[PDB]
Amino acid sequence: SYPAIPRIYAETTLNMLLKRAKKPRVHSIDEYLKDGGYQALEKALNMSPEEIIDWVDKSTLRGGGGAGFPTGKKWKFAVQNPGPRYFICNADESEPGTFKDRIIIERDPHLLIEGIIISSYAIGANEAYIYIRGEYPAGYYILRDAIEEAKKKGFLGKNILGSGFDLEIYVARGAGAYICGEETALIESLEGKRGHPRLKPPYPVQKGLWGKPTVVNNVETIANVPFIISMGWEEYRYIGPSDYAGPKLFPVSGKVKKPGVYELPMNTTLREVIFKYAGGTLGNKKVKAVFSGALDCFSSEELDIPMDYSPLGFGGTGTVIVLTEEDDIVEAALKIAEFYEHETCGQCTPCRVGCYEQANLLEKIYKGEATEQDWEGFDFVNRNIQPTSICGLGAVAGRLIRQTLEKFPEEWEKYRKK
Amino acid sequence: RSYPAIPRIYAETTLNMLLKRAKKPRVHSIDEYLKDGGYQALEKALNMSPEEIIDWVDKSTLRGGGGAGFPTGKKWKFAVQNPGPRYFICNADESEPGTFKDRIIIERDPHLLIEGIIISSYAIGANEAYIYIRGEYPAGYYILRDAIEEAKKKGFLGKNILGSGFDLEIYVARGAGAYICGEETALIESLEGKRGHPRLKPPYPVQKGLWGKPTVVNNVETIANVPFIISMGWEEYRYIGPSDYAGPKLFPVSGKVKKPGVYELPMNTTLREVIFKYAGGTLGNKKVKAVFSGALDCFSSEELDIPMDYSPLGFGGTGTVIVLTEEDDIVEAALKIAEFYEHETCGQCTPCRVGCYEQANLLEKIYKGEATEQDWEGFDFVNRNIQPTSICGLGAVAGRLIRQTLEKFPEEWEKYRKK
Amino acid sequence: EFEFPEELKTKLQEHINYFPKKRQAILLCLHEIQNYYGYIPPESLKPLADMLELPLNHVEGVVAFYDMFDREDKAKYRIRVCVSIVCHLMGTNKLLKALENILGIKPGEVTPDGKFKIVPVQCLGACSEAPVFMVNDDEYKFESEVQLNEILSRYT
Amino acid sequence: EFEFPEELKTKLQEHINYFPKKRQAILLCLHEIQNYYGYIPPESLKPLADMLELPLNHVEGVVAFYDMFDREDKAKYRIRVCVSIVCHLMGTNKLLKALENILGIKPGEVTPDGKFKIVPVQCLGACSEAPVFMVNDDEYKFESEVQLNEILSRYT
């Protein structure tokens, strides 16, 4: 018995990551095994760690956590440093609009576990962590139970399947901070401290948990690994466009008919995501904007872009929040400002005061209480959150809002007169 | 050193003795066993007289785990009443349907078994010991060969073990497909390089066994208890579970339960607790219709509150628990039992040879709806007449389970006779 | 002085024994404490600090940093209401209205019986089922007042 | 006349020298022979008998008695399928059907290439993992055809 969870809709054209997770329930080890589960693990343990790294590299797999970094390359960087090494599954998923990782965790936990074991073996880590956000309690209990199932079937512990490889997976819980998804803050949290990002370099792959080489990978990234081993890298790379190959999860929300998670190839366009897969808009209203989480704002003129990690592609985590013609962009922008206000960790001065002032002033603007100085100040602070920032949050806290100022000037002007 | 693939049988203990290590599904080698205090019982034993060790095992109330529940100390006493040389045999033939308890000690904690054999051999004055492992346990065989070499290298086997003047070699023999080779006299015949044909008893092995010499045959589980009795003393051992049926017992549970596996439990546990409290209840929460005690007995759902002990009203045997639920066809299940005995009678005794064969042949016709009235009456007759003139336990019990199903599930059988 | 009840202390010790190093268990322990008491009592932090072999200073800083922990108000059930972009767009305000009609309280307030506290939170990662809320560990889509009323009736 | 290859005769000699008496090694020798040739050649038994210092018909009787030994069919891989009660109850027939779909054979049969033989056996002592099968020494639980197919592709 687990806590109640809403039954998020899930749909796939590829039947890989969502092969089981398209059905909204826990799939336990027996169902997983019936689908040929843990056979990729068995094949992996008959390969050298170095061969596994090579396969993941050649697959073109990129991280699903936002930065799109080539996963094989990350692993290679870690293993060039002396052991011991650590492997961390980032299940902090707290960016607005983003709910792709939880359906893997909650419905097909063994897919994730199998990926963690193969990955840990690949980089020579004997201890792995899942850091799951505190607001996913069901995920936490489901993962603990799945780990025990795996122990019982001999997929975890010492000398796994007679290979000589030892692994324990520890499940840690967050406690309400979005910044703990940032890889260095996540590590600080795992060490029992406040989630404060660290100055990089060094990067975790060189000095991470307890100062040792550490690979941090997102849930979705890791869930690809069993497929790469099972199919082989060459067959995986046949999926979708050859430069951005394999499945991608797209969490779609807001004013669409069928909000939920879609498993699609990355040559899919944003227009197709909204209109072909997600069933179009509520009431068939015109699309006004798409927010890529709390990161970017695309206009209705930018819907024909690929959902890949190219320069002109959508990128990020594939998070798609749809606003239609009657939605107030300034009200929306305020919500984004409020998010960053609540999540800055405060270490860096322009980020600390800038995220606060951005939300404070924008609220005044929205409520029609802003002076001329508040207007000029809002503009200034929006452009000055980034300086001296040591992590991605400070770098992006002004970005979406700046884009709404550029793309929807007429809506902002209505508030200025107000 | 890689071994053949083995399925990872689930194991759970409330006592943490026999399954302290074997609850984890992997080979525990000698260094890991030593870290847990392994082989200290052997050292203690070698500082005791053989007679004192027999006395402790007697006072422990340890009974055999191979099906008969014979008191182990008593057996050893019988053997040492007879002039040596003597032989010690570990019975690892485990081939009864439902029974997979022994293999997890062999495959996961072999040094527990080896330590038990050394102490046992010392107690009865045997300088040569044998493990007879069924042929269908190839991994267990290779794991045991390697463990014996590890024990030799650390000075626990060979000549003059730890300066005691006690010599021991353990030889590992393999079976080749016969269930009857678990019967202690047929095992000995097989060890002598012949067909596994039970001998007429008496004499019993303890008097005349391997090469006609005093021979103690004990089950894997029985032997695995011996290091604990020495380590703890017989008082602390006897404090485990009820004082008349004390110590751990292993229960292999299979069929229609949520958590099939091996349970290490005290013997005051009830059948109902084994199924519902430990084994997680039934698949689909369906009603228990029957439990088969391997191929020996059939308990109905009205008999679930019995203790898993060796009392008259207790479950007994090897503690094998096969669970059938409400939709399981009892006649189909009885056929599988009949087929097992048909395939395993050694054929020496006429009623057993012909009876096991006819019970199967006739029950198949009944099952397929092709039995004449004479086939029906013949089935009943032959089921009651496998036992006469039998010289081993197989002939004595080949009809027992099937008879119980006729007595306890009449309506199900009647449906077949009508059709 | 303050002492942890035996049932609680057991759980805490389990968490502390779970990871390779004791101090890694700090968040799990604090979750456990808040679960037990309905809040983090300030008096609890000194003895937890000792169990973790950490300075009290460190523990206090950690409690203050993580938004899920609450040192101020005891509540049996925390109603976490998402106030982020997607939920806002799809009707957070109607949920808050329904909550006020049913419970008589606004965000940040506790009912006078100590039973319910409304806690505004950032995105709960269920945006497709907006507007979202949790009641302790249980998570739900808000449909209507009648539906919310039925859901809350399960928490007694 | 038939003569063992040297490397085999070495192993037979190892077994014969292992026990205190030569004749005790008869079953280890027969396993070794069957491992080597994929069956017990009828013509192998005479020279085995000589090394064991046993009459030929003693050896013949032992081969006849023990069900694991096969004098009729050469097979590289023996797929031993348990047909006893627990496996039957939990899905022997699904396994057999899957084997027939993949390999094209029923129990008792060998593939035309001589690679696989299905051998029905009594309880394999793994009843909690029913339905059970072996491929030579390796033992597995059958879960599904997809799972079985991947296992068998490991034997070339």
Ligand SMILES: Cc1cc2c(cc1C)N(C[C@H](O)[C@H](O)[C@H](O)COP(=O)(O)O)c1[nH]c(=O)[nH]c(=O)c1N2
């Ligand atoms: C403020 C902030 C917050 C987050 C991140 C970054 C920043 C700047 N990152 C990205 C994270 O640091 C890292 O890039 C990835 O976890 C690496 O895994 P992949 O290469 O994407 O598999 C991140 N990653 C993730 O997997 N889940 C998350 O919730 C977050 N959150």
Ligand SMILES: Cc1cc2c(cc1C)N(C[C@H](O)[C@H](O)[C@H](O)COP(=O)(O)O)c1[nH]c(=O)[nH]c(=O)c1N2
């Ligand atoms: C047909 C048949 C088959 C078997 C047995 C009996 C009979 C009648 N026995 C029991 C065996 O003869 C003997 O009682 C025990 O091995 C003695 O050891 P314990 O006193 O139980 O430790 C038996 N015992 C055992 O340890 N393993 C086995 O597989 C079998 N199989």
Ligand code: SF4
């Ligand atoms: S940029 Fe902002 S969130 Fe990141 S470390 Fe600096 S203050 Fe903290």
Ligand code: SF4
């Ligand atoms: S009773 Fe049956 S199995 Fe036992 S010796 Fe006689 S014929 Fe053989």
Ligand code: FES
């Ligand atoms: S915006 Fe409310 S759950 Fe994501």
Ligand code: FES
């Ligand atoms: S009944 Fe098949 S392994 Fe026991």
Ligand SMILES: [Cl-]
């Ligand atoms: Cl001593």
Ligand SMILES: [Cl-]
């Ligand atoms: Cl508002």
Ligand SMILES: [Cl-]
């Ligand atoms: Cl001859």
Ligand code: NA
């Ligand atoms: Na879910």
Ligand code: NA
């Ligand atoms: Na560790």
Ligand code: NA
């Ligand atoms: Na909880």
Ligand code: NA
């Ligand atoms: Na978090």
Ligand code: NA
């Ligand atoms: Na990274």
Ligand code: NA
């Ligand atoms: Na099991």
Ligand code: NA
């Ligand atoms: Na020792």
